[PDB]
Amino acid sequence: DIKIISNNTTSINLSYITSGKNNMIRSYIVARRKDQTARSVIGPSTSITVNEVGMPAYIRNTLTEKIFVNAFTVDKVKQLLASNQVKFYFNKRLNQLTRIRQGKFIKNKIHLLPGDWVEVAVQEYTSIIFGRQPSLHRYNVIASSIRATEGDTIKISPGIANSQNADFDGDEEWMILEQNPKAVIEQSILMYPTTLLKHDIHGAPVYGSIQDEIVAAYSLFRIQDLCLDEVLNILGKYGREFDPKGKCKFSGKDIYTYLIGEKINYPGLLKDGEIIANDVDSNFVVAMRHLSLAGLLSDHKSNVEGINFIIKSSYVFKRYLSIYGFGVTFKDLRPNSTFTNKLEAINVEKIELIKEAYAKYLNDVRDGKIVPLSKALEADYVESMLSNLTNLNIREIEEHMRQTLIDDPDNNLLKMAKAGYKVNPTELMYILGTYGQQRIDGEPAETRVLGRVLPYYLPDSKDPEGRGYILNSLTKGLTGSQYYFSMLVARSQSTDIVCETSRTGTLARKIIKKMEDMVVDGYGQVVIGNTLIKYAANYTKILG
């Protein structure tokens, strides 16, 4: 150990194995590189369910699966050998591996006995382990059934995207194949997506619909006058069992009742299997939400029913999108210039009023008419006036939304707002109203040379716009000085993101190592080592 006397940490000696983060234990013993593995870019697929994963050809033609030799499989193995389909052979009694090259191999060397195995090309419906990094929680690494697909990308159902925090702008995912029989059974039961449906802590489903599907759901519940043909066109392959009791006209509520094929009650949502809420929104169909219909169905019977409902409802929502369509246009946002002109005039008037009031106070202080305030109190008063202006903008936007809904009931942007996806009065204020105050560490930007931020303002300037209050909106377009403060906020956010990414991982590893050995014992108690931590595991001795 050269560090005993010196201070250089680059020389190689005995202690190198336990130097720092690059220990031999945590780089090669609790982690390692593996043989039967792959990695590739991901994409969506509507032909794959949440229980499945699509594997490209270039991977299917390299990875191999194992068939053990025993009384049940000997004839199949002999047939496969005869058909030139076997890629490897293993003699277990000699611990010898042989590669069957095409056009060259050894026949007498292959005497099949129980306990040996052969390796062939991987087949459909074999389970494989796959995931997306970083692996923050349990649902980032799962075992699913293989389906053959086209292209060179790995295909997943969008129903699992949220649980992995995944999207399709260049993400990659990795795969490994483990074929020991015990591992095969464990993969088939414990790591199967249907078994993982309900979140461990809060219990809501981890799979569901996303993005435009949400809007589709919201619209489907509201459609009113349909003939039987239109209902069946919407239902598609699930329309075989639909029962037109005696009716000739149908509503979206009828479709939802058919999809929920169960007569159950739940305060709020359901009564005798029919939705009694006013509308269907994000909280009904999105993963990790507290009003999920699939969650209620699972509570009633089992996870199989919940997974079935997720699959079926996603299918019908996408059929609705196929039949009727959906898209937001520029006219939905700004049909003409009336409202934006009005709000711009309001802002121009009010800011000048605020400046005049502040100037009056400053002039009175500059003479002997009032004692000055503290700096903090003066800042608080100015901030209060500016916040009042911002709230006025918010109220104007809300009134505009209500009026537009009255005049144009089929506005798609307002449909997004109503369904509960990404649109709300604050975002619309940014687009059409005002940007407001920009803050760093909870305060406006500090002065630096002549009591100012930029030389566009006079020394010791008291203009609020000179310290980060932005008057313009995005449709109007920010000026250069306003753009400075906007980019100040943006760049500070990115830098903080990098730093926090660094620190959170260290803390997470420490906590995981500390809590790793705490388990539930055979009597429903929580223990670590030989110490009793808690008498009843979840206060109930029932699964969390």
Question: In degrees rounded to 5, what are phi and psi of residue 387?
Answer: -65, -40
Cβ proximity to another protein, 78 vs 508, nearer residue: 508
Given Mg ion, another protein, none, residue 346, with its beta carbon under 5 to 8 Å by kind, binds none
* Shorter beta-carbon distance to Mg ion: residue 169 or 516: 169
Q: What is the dihedral of CA 374, 380, 385, 388, to 10 degrees?
A: -160
The whole-angstrom separation of Cα 343 and Cα 333 is 15
Min CB(161)–Mg ion separation in Å: 10
Site for another protein in 240-259 (CB under 8 A): 240, 242
* Contact with Mg ion (CB under 5 A) among 152, 167, 172, 352: 167
Shortest approach of another protein to residue 414 CB, angstroms? Answer: 12
According to CB under 8 A, which one of 2, 44, 68, 350 is a site residue for another protein?
A: 44
Minimal distance in Å, beta carbon 39 to another protein? Answer: 5
Binders of another protein among 86-115, rule CB under 8 A?
none
Q: Which range of residues in 65-73, 100-108, 330-338, 363-371 is near another protein by CB under 8 A?
A: 330-338
In the bound complex, what is the minimum distance in angstroms from residue 474's beta carbon to another protein? 5
- Shortest approach of another protein to residue 524 CB, angstroms? 13
Applying CB under 8 A, which of residues 11, 22, 62, 426 lies at the interface with another protein? 62
# residues near another protein by CB under 8 A? 178
Burial 266-277 (b: 16+ CB within 10 A, else e): eeebbeeeebee
Residues 185-244 that bind another protein (CB under 8 A): 186-187, 190-191, 202, 204, 210-213, 216, 227-230, 232-233, 235-237, 239-240, 242
CA 5/CA 251 separation, integer angstroms: 84
- Which of another protein, Mg ion, none has residue 184 at its interface (CB below 5 to 8 Å by kind)? none
Nearer CB in complex with another protein: 483/535: 483
Residues 6+ apart with CB under 8 A from 257: 273, 274, 275
Judged by CB under 8 A, the residue of 481, 524, 525, 526 near another protein is: 481
Nearest to Mg ion of 171, 254 (CB atom):
171
CA 35 from chain center: how many Å?
30
Q: Which is nearer to another protein, 14 or 406 (CB)?
A: 14
| CB of 78 or CB of 514, closer to another protein | 514
The label of the residue with tokens 């388990």 reads 519
Select 169 or 349, whichever has its Cβ closest to Mg ion.
169
Which C-beta is closer to another protein: that of 78 or that of 172? 172
State yes or no: residue 526 binds another protein (CB under 8 A): no
Q: Is 70 in the site for another protein (CB under 8 A)?
A: no
Distance CA 397, CA 425 (A): 6
- Check binding of 404 to another protein (CB under 8 A): no
Site for Mg ion in 405-464 (CB under 5 A): none
Pair 411, 328: CB distance under 8 Å? no
N-terminal to C-terminal alpha carbon distance within the chain: 50
**Residue of the chain from 3, 13, 22, 58 that contacts another protein (CB under 8 A):** 58
Which residues make Cβ contacts (< 8 Å) with residue 485, sequence separation at least 6?
A: 438, 445, 468, 470
Least Å distance, CB 493 to Mg ion, is: 18
Q: Which residues contact 288 (CB under 8 A, 6 or more apart)?
A: 162, 199, 202, 204, 205, 206, 208
Q: Which does 141 bind (CB under 5 to 8 A by kind): Mg ion, another protein, none?
A: another protein
Residues 168-197 that bind Mg ion (CB under 5 A): 169, 171
Residue 312, token pair as written in the block: 């079926």
Long-range interactions of 259-264: CB distance < 8 A, separation 24+: 259/309, 259/312, 259/313, 259/316, 260/293, 260/297, 260/309, 262/297, 262/300, 264/296, 264/300
Other beta carbons within 10 Å of 334: 13
Tokens, residue 329: 């246009």
Neighbours of 112 (CB within 10 A): 17
Amino acid letter at 119?
A: E
- Looking at the Cβ atoms of 32 and 369, the one nearer to another protein is 32
Q: Which residues bind Mg ion (CB under 5 A)?
A: 167, 169, 171
